[PDB]
Coordinates of C-alpha atoms in Angstrom, one line a residue:
Chain A
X1 CA 0.2 0.0 0.0
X2 CA 0.6 3.8 -0.2
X3 CA 1.0 5.7 3.3
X4 CA -0.4 8.8 3.3
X5 CA 1.7 11.0 6.1
Chain B
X1 CA 35.8 24.6 -7.1
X2 CA 33.6 21.9 -6.1
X3 CA 30.3 20.9 -6.8
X4 CA 27.3 19.3 -4.5
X5 CA 23.5 18.7 -4.2
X6 CA 22.8 22.5 -2.9
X7 CA 19.1 23.4 -1.9
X8 CA 18.2 27.2 -2.2
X9 CA 18.3 28.9 1.1
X10 CA 14.6 27.8 3.3
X11 CA 14.3 31.1 4.9
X12 CA 11.1 32.6 3.0
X13 CA 9.0 28.8 2.7
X14 CA 10.3 28.8 6.5
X15 CA 8.2 31.8 7.4
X16 CA 5.4 30.0 5.9
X17 CA 5.0 26.7 7.5
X18 CA 1.8 26.2 9.4
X19 CA 0.2 23.1 11.4
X20 CA -3.0 22.0 10.3
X21 CA -5.2 19.9 12.8
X22 CA -8.9 18.4 11.9
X23 CA -9.6 15.9 14.1
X24 CA -6.9 13.2 15.5
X25 CA -5.0 14.0 12.3
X26 CA -2.0 16.9 12.6
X27 CA 0.0 17.7 9.2
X28 CA 1.7 21.1 8.0
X29 CA -0.2 23.8 5.8
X30 CA 1.4 26.5 3.8
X31 CA 0.4 29.7 4.3
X32 CA 0.2 32.7 1.7
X33 CA -1.3 35.5 2.1
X34 CA -4.7 34.9 3.7
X35 CA -4.5 31.2 2.3
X36 CA -3.4 28.0 4.4
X37 CA -2.9 25.2 2.0
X38 CA -2.6 21.1 2.8
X39 CA -3.4 18.0 1.9
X40 CA -6.9 16.9 1.7
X41 CA -6.8 14.1 3.7
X42 CA -6.6 16.1 7.1
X43 CA -10.0 15.2 7.3
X44 CA -9.3 11.4 7.5
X45 CA -9.2 8.9 10.1
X46 CA -7.2 5.8 9.6
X47 CA -10.4 3.7 8.9
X48 CA -11.2 6.2 6.1
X49 CA -8.0 6.0 4.4
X50 CA -9.1 2.9 3.3
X51 CA -11.9 4.1 0.4
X52 CA -12.6 7.6 0.9
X53 CA -15.0 10.1 -0.1
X54 CA -13.2 13.6 -0.1
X55 CA -16.2 15.2 -1.3
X56 CA -18.8 13.5 1.5
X57 CA -16.5 13.9 4.1
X58 CA -15.8 17.7 3.7
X59 CA -19.8 19.1 4.0
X60 CA -19.5 17.1 7.2
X61 CA -17.2 19.7 8.4
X62 CA -17.1 23.5 9.5
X63 CA -14.7 26.3 9.5
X64 CA -14.3 25.3 13.2
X65 CA -13.6 21.5 12.4
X66 CA -9.6 22.9 11.2
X67 CA -7.9 24.6 13.9
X68 CA -4.1 26.1 12.2
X69 CA -1.5 27.9 14.0
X70 CA 1.6 29.4 13.6
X71 CA 4.4 29.7 16.1
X72 CA 1.8 29.9 19.2
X73 CA -0.6 32.0 17.7
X74 CA -4.2 29.8 16.7
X75 CA -5.0 31.2 13.6
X76 CA -9.0 31.3 13.0
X77 CA -10.5 29.9 9.8
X78 CA -13.0 31.3 8.0
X79 CA -13.6 29.8 4.5
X80 CA -12.7 26.3 3.2
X81 CA -12.8 25.1 -0.4
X82 CA -11.4 21.7 -2.1
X83 CA -8.8 22.0 -5.0
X84 CA -8.3 18.5 -6.1
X85 CA -5.9 16.8 -3.6
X86 CA -5.7 19.8 -1.6
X87 CA -7.8 22.1 0.7
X88 CA -7.5 26.0 0.9
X89 CA -8.3 27.4 4.5
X90 CA -9.2 31.1 4.5
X91 CA -7.8 32.3 7.7
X92 CA -8.7 35.6 9.6
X93 CA -4.5 37.1 9.0
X94 CA -2.6 37.7 6.2
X95 CA 1.2 36.0 6.5
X96 CA 3.3 38.7 6.6
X97 CA 6.2 36.8 6.2
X98 CA 4.6 36.0 2.8
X99 CA 7.0 36.4 -0.2
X100 CA 7.0 37.0 -3.6
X101 CA 6.0 33.7 -5.3
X102 CA 4.2 31.6 -7.8
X103 CA 2.9 27.8 -8.4
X104 CA 4.5 25.7 -11.5
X105 CA 3.9 22.2 -12.3
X106 CA 7.3 21.2 -12.1
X107 CA 8.3 18.6 -15.2
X108 CA 9.9 15.1 -15.2
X109 CA 13.9 15.6 -15.1
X110 CA 13.5 19.2 -13.0
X111 CA 14.8 19.6 -9.8
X112 CA 13.7 21.4 -6.3
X113 CA 14.6 21.8 -2.6
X114 CA 12.0 20.1 -0.2
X115 CA 11.5 22.0 3.3
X116 CA 10.9 18.8 5.4
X117 CA 8.5 19.7 8.4
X118 CA 6.9 18.2 11.1
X119 CA 4.3 19.6 13.2
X120 CA 4.3 23.1 11.1
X121 CA 7.7 23.2 12.2
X122 CA 10.4 22.9 9.4
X123 CA 13.2 19.9 10.2
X124 CA 15.5 20.0 8.1
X125 CA 16.2 20.5 4.0
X126 CA 17.6 18.6 0.8
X127 CA 17.4 18.4 -3.3
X128 CA 15.5 16.0 -5.3
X129 CA 14.5 15.6 -9.2
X130 CA 11.7 14.9 -10.0
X131 CA 11.8 11.1 -11.3
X132 CA 10.5 10.1 -15.0
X133 CA 8.2 8.0 -13.1
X134 CA 6.5 10.9 -11.2
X135 CA 8.1 9.7 -7.8
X136 CA 10.9 11.5 -5.8
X137 CA 13.6 10.0 -3.2
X138 CA 12.8 11.9 -0.3
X139 CA 13.3 11.3 3.2
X140 CA 9.8 11.6 5.1
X141 CA 8.3 10.7 8.2
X142 CA 4.6 9.9 9.4
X143 CA 3.6 14.0 10.0
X144 CA 5.4 15.1 6.7
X145 CA 2.6 15.2 4.7
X146 CA 2.0 19.3 3.5
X147 CA 5.9 19.3 3.2
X148 CA 6.8 21.8 -0.2
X149 CA 8.8 21.5 -2.9
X150 CA 10.4 25.0 -4.3
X151 CA 12.9 26.6 -6.5
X152 CA 13.9 30.1 -5.8
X153 CA 14.6 32.8 -8.7
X154 CA 15.4 36.2 -8.1
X155 CA 12.8 37.2 -5.2
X156 CA 10.3 34.7 -6.0
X157 CA 9.1 31.3 -4.8
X158 CA 8.5 28.9 -7.4
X159 CA 6.4 26.6 -4.9
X160 CA 5.7 23.3 -7.2
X161 CA 5.4 20.2 -4.9
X162 CA 3.3 19.6 -1.6
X163 CA 3.9 16.0 0.1
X164 CA 0.9 13.8 0.4
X165 CA 2.3 9.9 0.8
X166 CA 4.8 7.2 0.2
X167 CA 5.1 4.7 -1.8
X168 CA 5.5 1.2 -1.4
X169 CA 9.6 1.2 -2.3
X170 CA 9.9 4.5 0.1
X171 CA 9.6 7.2 -2.4
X172 CA 7.3 9.6 -2.3
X173 CA 4.6 10.9 -4.5
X174 CA 2.5 14.4 -3.8
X175 CA 0.7 17.1 -5.9
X176 CA 1.6 20.5 -7.3
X177 CA 0.3 23.2 -5.5
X178 CA -3.2 23.2 -7.4
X179 CA -3.9 19.6 -5.5
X180 CA -3.0 17.7 -9.0
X181 CA -0.8 14.1 -8.2
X182 CA 2.0 14.6 -9.9
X183 CA 1.7 10.7 -11.8
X184 CA -1.4 8.2 -11.9
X185 CA -1.5 8.6 -8.3
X186 CA -4.2 9.3 -5.6
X187 CA -4.8 10.3 -2.3
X188 CA -6.0 6.9 -1.0
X189 CA -4.6 4.1 1.1
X190 CA -4.8 1.5 -1.7
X191 CA -2.2 -0.8 -3.5
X192 CA -0.2 1.6 -5.7
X193 CA 3.1 1.3 -7.3
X194 CA 5.6 3.7 -9.0
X195 CA 6.1 2.3 -12.7
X196 CA 9.8 1.7 -13.6
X197 CA 11.9 4.5 -14.1
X198 CA 14.6 5.4 -16.3
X199 CA 17.8 7.9 -16.2
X200 CA 17.3 11.5 -16.8
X201 CA 20.1 11.6 -19.9
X202 CA 19.9 15.2 -19.9
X203 CA 21.4 15.4 -16.7
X204 CA 24.2 12.9 -16.7
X205 CA 25.2 15.1 -19.8
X206 CA 25.1 18.6 -18.1
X207 CA 26.8 16.9 -15.1
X208 CA 29.7 15.7 -17.5
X209 CA 29.7 19.1 -18.4
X210 CA 30.1 20.1 -15.1
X211 CA 33.4 17.6 -14.9
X212 CA 34.6 19.0 -17.8
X213 CA 34.3 23.2 -16.2
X214 CA 35.9 21.8 -13.5
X215 CA 38.3 21.1 -15.6
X216 CA 38.0 17.2 -15.0
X217 CA 38.8 16.2 -18.9
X218 CA 39.7 12.0 -18.6
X219 CA 36.5 10.4 -19.8
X220 CA 36.5 12.0 -23.0
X221 CA 37.2 10.1 -26.5
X222 CA 38.2 11.1 -30.2
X223 CA 34.6 9.8 -31.4
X224 CA 31.6 11.5 -32.0
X225 CA 27.9 9.3 -32.6
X226 CA 24.9 10.5 -34.5
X227 CA 22.0 11.1 -32.3
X228 CA 20.1 8.0 -33.6
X229 CA 23.1 5.4 -32.7
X230 CA 23.3 7.3 -29.5
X231 CA 19.8 5.9 -28.6
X232 CA 20.1 2.6 -29.7
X233 CA 22.6 2.5 -26.8
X234 CA 20.4 4.7 -24.1
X235 CA 17.7 2.2 -24.5
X236 CA 19.8 -0.8 -23.9
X237 CA 21.3 0.6 -20.4
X238 CA 17.6 2.1 -19.6
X239 CA 18.8 5.8 -20.2
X240 CA 15.8 8.3 -22.0
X241 CA 16.7 8.6 -25.5
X242 CA 18.2 12.1 -26.4
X243 CA 16.5 14.1 -28.7
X244 CA 16.9 17.5 -30.7
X245 CA 15.7 19.9 -28.2
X246 CA 17.6 18.8 -25.2
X247 CA 20.6 19.2 -27.6
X248 CA 19.7 22.5 -28.1
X249 CA 19.6 23.0 -24.2
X250 CA 23.1 21.7 -23.8
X251 CA 24.7 24.3 -26.3
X252 CA 25.8 26.7 -23.8
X253 CA 27.8 23.9 -21.5
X254 CA 28.4 22.6 -25.1
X255 CA 30.3 26.3 -25.9
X256 CA 31.9 27.1 -22.7
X257 CA 33.2 23.7 -22.7
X258 CA 34.4 23.6 -26.8
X259 CA 32.6 19.9 -26.3
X260 CA 30.3 19.1 -29.3
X261 CA 27.1 17.6 -27.4
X262 CA 27.4 14.8 -29.8
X263 CA 31.2 14.2 -29.2
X264 CA 30.1 14.1 -25.5
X265 CA 27.3 11.6 -26.1
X266 CA 30.1 9.4 -27.5
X267 CA 31.9 10.1 -23.9
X268 CA 28.7 8.6 -22.6
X269 CA 27.9 6.1 -24.8
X270 CA 31.6 5.0 -23.9
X271 CA 31.1 5.2 -20.4
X272 CA 28.5 3.2 -20.4
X273 CA 29.6 0.1 -22.1
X274 CA 33.2 0.2 -20.0
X275 CA 32.3 1.3 -16.9
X276 CA 34.6 3.9 -15.2
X277 CA 37.5 1.8 -14.7
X278 CA 37.2 2.6 -10.9
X279 CA 37.5 6.2 -11.3
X280 CA 35.8 8.9 -10.2
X281 CA 33.9 11.8 -11.7
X282 CA 32.9 14.8 -9.4
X283 CA 33.9 12.5 -7.0
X284 CA 31.5 10.6 -7.9
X285 CA 31.8 6.3 -8.4
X286 CA 28.2 6.5 -10.3
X287 CA 27.2 8.5 -13.2
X288 CA 24.7 11.5 -12.1
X289 CA 21.7 12.1 -13.2
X290 CA 20.3 14.4 -10.4
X291 CA 21.5 17.8 -11.6
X292 CA 19.2 19.5 -14.7
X293 CA 21.8 22.3 -16.9
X294 CA 20.1 24.8 -15.1
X295 CA 21.2 23.4 -11.7
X296 CA 24.8 23.5 -13.3
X297 CA 24.9 26.9 -15.0
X298 CA 23.4 28.2 -11.4
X299 CA 26.6 26.1 -9.6
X300 CA 29.5 25.8 -11.7
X301 CA 31.4 29.0 -13.1
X302 CA 31.3 31.4 -15.7
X303 CA 34.8 30.3 -17.2
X304 CA 36.5 26.8 -17.3
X305 CA 39.5 25.1 -15.7
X306 CA 41.5 25.1 -19.1
Chain C
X1 CA 11.6 6.3 4.9
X2 CA 14.2 7.4 3.1
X3 CA 17.2 9.0 3.4
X4 CA 19.0 11.9 2.4
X5 CA 21.9 14.6 2.9
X6 CA 19.8 17.4 4.5
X7 CA 20.6 20.6 5.6
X8 CA 19.3 22.6 8.6
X9 CA 16.9 25.4 7.7
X10 CA 18.7 27.9 6.5
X11 CA 16.0 31.0 7.9
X12 CA 17.5 32.0 11.2
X13 CA 21.7 32.0 9.8
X14 CA 20.3 34.2 6.8
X15 CA 19.0 36.9 8.5
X16 CA 22.9 37.3 9.3
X17 CA 24.8 37.4 6.5
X18 CA 26.0 40.6 5.5
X19 CA 28.2 42.1 2.7
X20 CA 31.6 43.9 4.1
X21 CA 33.9 45.8 1.6
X22 CA 37.2 47.4 2.2
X23 CA 39.4 48.9 -0.6
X24 CA 38.1 46.8 -4.0
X25 CA 37.8 43.4 -2.1
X26 CA 34.3 42.4 -1.3
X27 CA 33.1 39.4 0.9
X28 CA 30.7 38.2 3.6
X29 CA 30.4 38.7 7.4
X30 CA 28.2 37.5 9.6
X31 CA 25.8 40.0 12.1
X32 CA 25.0 39.1 15.5
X33 CA 23.7 41.6 17.4
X34 CA 26.3 44.4 16.6
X35 CA 28.9 42.8 15.9
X36 CA 29.6 41.8 12.3
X37 CA 32.4 39.1 11.7
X38 CA 34.4 38.2 8.3
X39 CA 37.8 36.9 7.4
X40 CA 40.5 39.6 8.1
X41 CA 41.9 39.2 4.6
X42 CA 39.2 41.6 3.9
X43 CA 41.9 44.3 4.4
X44 CA 44.0 42.4 1.5
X45 CA 44.8 43.3 -2.0
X46 CA 46.2 40.7 -4.4
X47 CA 49.7 41.6 -4.2
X48 CA 49.4 41.7 -0.2
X49 CA 48.1 37.9 -0.3
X50 CA 51.7 36.4 -0.9
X51 CA 53.1 37.3 2.0
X52 CA 51.0 39.8 4.2
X53 CA 51.6 40.8 8.0
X54 CA 47.8 41.7 9.5
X55 CA 48.8 43.6 12.4
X56 CA 50.3 45.6 10.3
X57 CA 47.9 46.1 7.2
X58 CA 45.2 47.1 9.9
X59 CA 46.7 49.7 12.0
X60 CA 46.5 51.7 8.4
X61 CA 43.1 51.3 8.4
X62 CA 40.2 53.6 10.1
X63 CA 36.5 52.4 11.2
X64 CA 35.3 54.1 7.7
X65 CA 37.6 52.0 5.6
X66 CA 35.2 49.3 6.5
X67 CA 31.6 49.6 4.2
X68 CA 29.1 47.5 5.7
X69 CA 25.4 46.8 4.0
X70 CA 22.3 44.9 5.1
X71 CA 19.8 44.9 2.1
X72 CA 19.9 48.1 0.8
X73 CA 21.1 49.7 4.6
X74 CA 24.5 50.7 4.9
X75 CA 25.8 49.7 8.5
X76 CA 28.2 52.1 10.1
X77 CA 31.2 51.0 11.7
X78 CA 31.8 52.5 14.9
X79 CA 34.3 50.1 16.1
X80 CA 37.4 47.1 15.0
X81 CA 39.5 44.3 16.2
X82 CA 41.3 41.6 15.2
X83 CA 40.7 38.1 16.3
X84 CA 43.2 35.2 15.9
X85 CA 42.0 35.4 11.8
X86 CA 38.9 37.1 12.1
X87 CA 38.0 40.8 12.3
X88 CA 35.1 41.8 14.7
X89 CA 33.3 45.2 13.1
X90 CA 31.4 46.9 16.0
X91 CA 28.3 49.0 14.2
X92 CA 25.8 51.1 15.1
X93 CA 23.0 49.0 15.3
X94 CA 22.1 45.2 16.4
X95 CA 20.8 42.8 14.5
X96 CA 17.2 42.5 14.9
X97 CA 17.3 39.2 13.3
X98 CA 19.7 38.4 15.7
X99 CA 18.6 34.3 16.7
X100 CA 19.7 32.4 19.8
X101 CA 23.3 31.5 19.0
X102 CA 26.9 30.4 20.2
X103 CA 30.3 29.7 19.0
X104 CA 31.6 25.7 19.0
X105 CA 34.6 23.9 17.6
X106 CA 33.3 21.7 15.5
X107 CA 35.6 18.2 16.0
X108 CA 36.9 16.0 13.4
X109 CA 34.4 13.6 11.9
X110 CA 31.0 16.1 12.6
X111 CA 28.7 17.6 10.9
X112 CA 27.5 20.9 9.7
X113 CA 25.0 22.7 7.1
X114 CA 27.0 26.0 5.5
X115 CA 25.4 28.7 4.0
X116 CA 26.7 29.3 0.6
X117 CA 26.5 33.3 0.4
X118 CA 27.9 35.6 -2.8
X119 CA 27.9 39.7 -1.8
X120 CA 26.1 39.0 1.5
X121 CA 23.8 37.2 -0.1
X122 CA 22.5 33.4 0.2
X123 CA 23.1 31.5 -3.1
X124 CA 22.3 27.7 -1.2
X125 CA 22.7 25.3 1.0
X126 CA 24.4 21.9 1.4
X127 CA 25.7 19.8 4.1
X128 CA 29.5 18.5 4.9
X129 CA 31.5 16.8 7.2
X130 CA 35.1 18.3 8.5
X131 CA 37.0 15.7 7.5
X132 CA 40.0 14.3 9.1
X133 CA 42.4 16.4 8.0
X134 CA 40.1 19.3 8.7
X135 CA 39.0 19.9 5.1
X136 CA 35.3 19.9 3.7
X137 CA 34.4 18.8 0.5
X138 CA 32.2 22.4 -0.8
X139 CA 31.5 24.1 -3.8
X140 CA 32.7 27.5 -3.4
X141 CA 33.3 30.5 -5.8
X142 CA 35.5 33.5 -5.5
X143 CA 33.2 36.0 -3.4
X144 CA 32.0 33.0 -1.3
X145 CA 34.6 34.0 1.6
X146 CA 32.7 34.7 5.3
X147 CA 30.0 32.1 4.6
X148 CA 29.9 29.8 7.2
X149 CA 28.8 26.1 8.5
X150 CA 26.4 25.8 11.3
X151 CA 24.2 23.5 13.4
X152 CA 21.0 24.3 14.9
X153 CA 19.9 22.8 18.1
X154 CA 16.4 23.6 19.8
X155 CA 16.1 27.6 18.8
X156 CA 19.9 28.2 19.3
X157 CA 22.3 28.2 15.9
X158 CA 25.7 26.6 16.8
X159 CA 28.1 28.5 14.5
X160 CA 31.0 26.8 13.7
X161 CA 32.8 27.9 10.6
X162 CA 33.9 30.1 8.7
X163 CA 34.7 30.2 5.2
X164 CA 38.3 31.7 4.1
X165 CA 40.0 29.7 1.1
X166 CA 40.2 27.0 -0.9
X167 CA 43.0 24.4 -1.3
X168 CA 44.8 23.2 -4.8
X169 CA 43.0 19.6 -4.5
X170 CA 39.9 22.1 -5.1
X171 CA 38.2 21.0 -1.1
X172 CA 38.0 24.2 1.7
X173 CA 40.0 25.1 4.8
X174 CA 38.3 27.5 7.3
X175 CA 38.0 28.5 11.1
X176 CA 35.7 29.0 13.7
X177 CA 34.0 31.5 14.7
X178 CA 36.9 33.0 16.9
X179 CA 39.2 32.6 13.9
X180 CA 41.0 29.8 14.8
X181 CA 41.8 27.5 11.8
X182 CA 40.3 24.0 11.1
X183 CA 43.6 22.3 10.4
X184 CA 47.4 23.1 10.1
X185 CA 45.9 26.2 7.2
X186 CA 47.1 29.9 7.6
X187 CA 45.3 32.8 5.2
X188 CA 48.1 33.2 2.8
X189 CA 48.5 32.8 -0.7
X190 CA 50.9 30.2 -0.5
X191 CA 52.1 26.8 -0.9
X192 CA 49.7 25.0 1.3
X193 CA 48.0 21.2 0.8
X194 CA 45.7 18.8 2.3
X195 CA 47.0 16.3 4.4
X196 CA 46.4 12.8 3.4
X197 CA 42.5 11.8 4.8
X198 CA 41.0 8.8 5.9
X199 CA 37.5 7.2 6.4
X200 CA 35.4 7.8 9.1
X201 CA 34.6 4.5 10.7
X202 CA 32.2 6.1 13.2
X203 CA 30.1 7.2 10.6
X204 CA 30.6 4.4 8.0
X205 CA 29.5 2.2 11.2
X206 CA 26.1 5.0 12.2
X207 CA 24.9 4.6 7.9
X208 CA 24.9 0.6 8.3
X209 CA 22.7 0.7 11.2
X210 CA 20.5 3.6 9.2
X211 CA 20.2 0.8 6.6
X212 CA 18.8 -1.4 9.2
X213 CA 16.6 0.7 10.6
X214 CA 15.6 1.3 7.1
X215 CA 15.0 -2.6 7.4
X216 CA 17.4 -3.9 4.8
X217 CA 20.2 -6.7 6.6
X218 CA 21.6 -7.8 3.4
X219 CA 25.1 -7.0 4.8
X220 CA 25.3 -8.9 7.9
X221 CA 26.8 -11.9 8.8
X222 CA 27.2 -14.5 11.7
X223 CA 30.3 -13.9 12.5
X224 CA 31.6 -10.8 15.2
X225 CA 35.4 -9.1 15.8
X226 CA 37.4 -8.4 18.6
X227 CA 37.7 -4.3 18.2
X228 CA 41.5 -5.1 17.5
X229 CA 41.2 -7.5 14.9
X230 CA 38.7 -5.0 13.4
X231 CA 41.9 -2.2 13.4
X232 CA 44.2 -4.7 11.9
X233 CA 41.4 -4.2 9.2
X234 CA 40.3 -0.7 9.2
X235 CA 44.6 0.3 9.0
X236 CA 44.5 -1.9 5.7
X237 CA 41.7 0.0 4.2
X238 CA 42.6 3.7 5.2
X239 CA 39.7 3.6 8.0
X240 CA 40.2 5.7 11.1
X241 CA 40.7 2.9 14.3
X242 CA 37.5 1.7 16.2
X243 CA 38.0 2.8 19.8
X244 CA 36.5 2.0 22.9
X245 CA 34.5 5.7 23.2
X246 CA 33.2 5.3 19.1
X247 CA 32.0 1.7 20.4
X248 CA 30.2 3.4 23.3
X249 CA 28.5 5.8 21.1
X250 CA 27.4 3.3 18.3
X251 CA 24.7 1.6 21.8
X252 CA 21.8 3.8 21.2
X253 CA 21.7 2.6 17.7
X254 CA 22.7 -0.8 18.1
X255 CA 20.1 -1.3 20.9
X256 CA 17.2 -0.3 18.3
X257 CA 18.4 -2.4 15.8
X258 CA 19.4 -5.5 18.2
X259 CA 22.9 -5.8 16.4
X260 CA 26.4 -5.8 18.5
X261 CA 28.8 -3.5 17.6
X262 CA 31.3 -5.8 17.1
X263 CA 28.9 -8.2 15.0
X264 CA 28.4 -4.9 12.9
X265 CA 31.7 -4.2 12.9
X266 CA 32.3 -7.6 11.2
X267 CA 29.8 -6.6 8.8
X268 CA 32.4 -3.9 7.7
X269 CA 34.9 -6.1 7.8
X270 CA 33.7 -8.5 5.6
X271 CA 32.3 -5.4 3.3
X272 CA 35.7 -4.2 3.2
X273 CA 37.2 -7.3 2.2
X274 CA 34.4 -8.5 -0.3
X275 CA 33.4 -5.0 -1.9
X276 CA 29.4 -4.5 -1.9
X277 CA 28.8 -7.1 -5.5
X278 CA 27.0 -4.5 -7.2
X279 CA 24.6 -4.1 -4.7
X280 CA 23.2 -0.5 -3.1
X281 CA 23.0 0.2 1.0
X282 CA 20.4 3.0 1.4
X283 CA 20.6 4.0 -2.4
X284 CA 24.7 4.0 -2.1
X285 CA 27.1 2.1 -4.0
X286 CA 29.5 3.5 -2.0
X287 CA 30.3 3.1 2.2
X288 CA 29.3 6.5 3.2
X289 CA 31.2 8.0 6.0
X290 CA 29.5 11.7 6.0
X291 CA 26.6 10.6 8.8
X292 CA 27.4 11.0 12.2
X293 CA 25.6 8.8 14.1
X294 CA 23.8 12.2 15.9
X295 CA 22.7 12.6 12.2
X296 CA 21.3 9.2 12.0
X297 CA 19.2 9.3 14.8
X298 CA 17.6 12.8 13.6
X299 CA 16.7 11.8 10.1
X300 CA 15.9 7.9 10.8
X301 CA 12.3 6.6 13.0
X302 CA 12.0 6.1 16.5
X303 CA 11.2 2.3 14.8
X304 CA 12.7 -0.6 13.1
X305 CA 11.8 -1.9 10.3
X306 CA 11.1 -5.5 11.0
Chain D
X1 CA 48.3 27.6 -3.7
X2 CA 45.8 28.3 -1.4
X3 CA 43.3 30.5 -2.8
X4 CA 41.5 33.3 -0.9
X5 CA 37.9 33.3 -1.5

């Protein structure tokens, strides 16, 4: 997955 | 002499970072005039990220659902709208540290400086290239969203990037300052991956010119090449093809060194085929593609060593 | 994730650069409170540099032999004294952008950020390590003297370096902010050369820990080593010896990763002997010694990937 | 020679 900071 | 990855002085961007809090999520926002920009997923929760509808989630918030602070000063929100992947929060004070600025969409291959920030507080700065696959090799942690990337020309600040997320490979994706993602990416907690990348040819060449402007010539040769024969080799090595427009761009650097672009390409083509034989260029053991030709002119001198 | 050479936000140092002119020479000075610091060779001429007597050259100047400007504001000099290799110019206004600060002598191996400046105007910023031979690989041009190097802790600015000159190899030499040179160097236009350098072992190790904190472990092994057997290998490869004090320093990084320092050294000793076999660490093909253990803790996370 | 910037 992408990770939204 | 010398040649380094060099960021732009960050004093002007620093006077524009703030902290923006919605619910339990905190991140960084950019306060220009009376608007604070930030990534729109500030209105998300960990559960929401998996399959969020932004439109829906935002109608459910008011102005006072958003906390904005600069230093210890609470700024009051008096308007809000969603632009693409960003939020525009109108606040009751205009930033008095607001510099001259503009918003640009950066192109693949171009560079900018990134002011990494946590809790509206600037931790550090470095320079990164927009890759061909629209990712950047940054260094970011949780809470770094809303961190921004920019260049400075004269007294103007060209904002080109807001950080929004991190891909599985550990590289970063983000938007320009209108909220439109760089690349085929979306702000959702879903399986997403960088595309294959390639080496920015125009930059490797700009950098070889820097080596020469820095008076090192060891990697040159007697040969020349056709653009087209260069490219069969570029392809084999996962370098971008060179184009006539990229050749025109390198002319000033060609003129300052007296090395013909196609001559330089033959240099490169040889480097690609024979390696560097344990040697360094500009103190690197590797071919460097993260300096544009504009980066070389700014950093190098007007006069070549020899 | 990610790992980059990262400079400190330069907004605070930028509000302190000015231009200092004596005769036909112009360079950069640092304006803290009511003092502007600059290299003393601002009072030199090209002919003088070859064999100058500073004492003699300075008694020959008055307060109004010095022009100091910030932005477009001419600052008036109302006092002057020579401290070591620097000049302290007392001016008639206190810098209102003066931050909390102090002056430190940096030790070999430690890092700082450098705000490169021309004509009191900040061009760019990057991070460089003080080498074992007391030089730094900066990027400087004519007119860059008085450019400064610093760290920032909390709200305080630790000034550790003013740029004074460039050596034949193209590396840079300079003073702390009391004017005392780093290294066996003097501010004269005379034959002078960098001593042999060596690789900062403590840093290579701190960086291998970063690789692991970044969850890469490929270069580890089953072995361990004695400090003393490590060193016979360190010497062969032109690495600094490791000492018990350097082992104590790496313990926190050892504790966060669970890799014993002596175990890590065995990792390194193997890297040194077998090369990297075409692989990368933290995206480098080379062993990197320009990140201190303090640089790793600041940049990395508190939690290891796996 | 050294060069004083």
